[PDB]
Chains A and B, each alone.
With several copies, the nearest count.
Chain A
């Protein structure tokens, strides 16, 4: 196909043009809700921890995909390996509240605790980038899913439920020195 490139209108040419035939495509895997729907690790933990999806690794499957969007929305599931009981408080709660049983508190039960939490921010959607301040770089303090507290938090896993992404942003593969390909060991039978 020949088109006026400057306009930037999308152009999707096909194999048919030179006698080929287009082949049926199944894209369930690339579906946003599906691909974001899985448990991923959070690395920097402390006995008192505020749930911030931006804590996900920047090159992780979810971490990178989340970053490749400007705005997002979702509910959540968390898995916590903790010593003592775990207390969670919603977005906007005083840190002091994590000390009280009246808030959702889960009594220890091996090997860990898995919970379903609702989106609790005061905004219609959240962002992975915010050009400006929230005070009278970092993101505004209100961009969180609440906080959790236990005597010791050994592991945290987060899972995005009902994810919605908006306004996509750059997503990068590892850079290549070789100038031909990026080569690495693909799994193959032993012997």
Chain B
């Protein structure tokens, strides 16, 4: 959403489970599945967080750090920028082509 005179270069990475904590730098995260992009004429960039797990399905809810309910992290970095101190990157999420939800439940407190 920055002004014409503000530029930036970002990176997004998918860190699978297996590491204790997420990479704090683009250098360390580069070894993961990632994408980098420039700010220009086109304001939007879309990236797919892949489903990579041992089991064929994952739980939607979470309980405690377990293999079926936490599938890693997504890390968003700024490689650098030029005159973009007060400019922002709006992030939204949607379902992918093969996203699927499985078993109907009524878990809300009523």
- Spell out A's residues near B (CB within 8 Å): 1-6, 11-15, 17-18, 20, 22-27, 29-30, 35, 38, 41, 57, 59-61, 64, 89-94, 96-97, 99-103, 120, 122-124, 134-136, 140-142, 174, 181-186
Contact = CB atoms under 8 A, between A and B. Distances in A.
Contact of A25 (B46, B60, B99, B106): B99
Contacts of A22: 96-98
Interface in B27-82: 33, 35, 37, 41-48, 50-51, 55-70
A13 B66 contact: no
A130 B98 CA distance: 30
15 contacts: A1-B45, A2-B37, A12-B97, A29-B103, A30-B101, A92-B59, A92-B103, A96-B107, A100-B106, A100-B108, A103-B105, A122-B56, A123-B56, A142-B68, A183-B63
Interface of B: 17, 33, 35, 37, 41-48, 50-51, 55-70, 94, 96-110
Contacts of B70: 136, 181
B68 A20 contact: no
Label chain B's interface by main secondary structure: loop
A89 B58 CA distance: 16
A93 B103 contact: yes
Contacts of A5: 42-44
Contacts of B104: 29, 35, 38, 61, 103
Contact of A135 (B41, B42, B66): B66
Label chain A's interface by main secondary structure: loop
Contact of B59 (A12, A38, A64, A122): A122
A188 B78 CA distance: 41
Contacts of B98: 22-25
A18 B107 contact: no
Nearest to B35: A18
Contacts of B107: 89, 93-94, 96-97, 100
A32 B109 CA distance: 23
B105 A93 contact: yes
A155 to B, nearest CB: 15
B46 A1 contact: yes
Contacts of B106: 60-61, 97, 100-103
Contacts of A17: 48
B94 A181 contact: no
A139 to B, nearest CB: 13
A26 B61 CA distance: 20
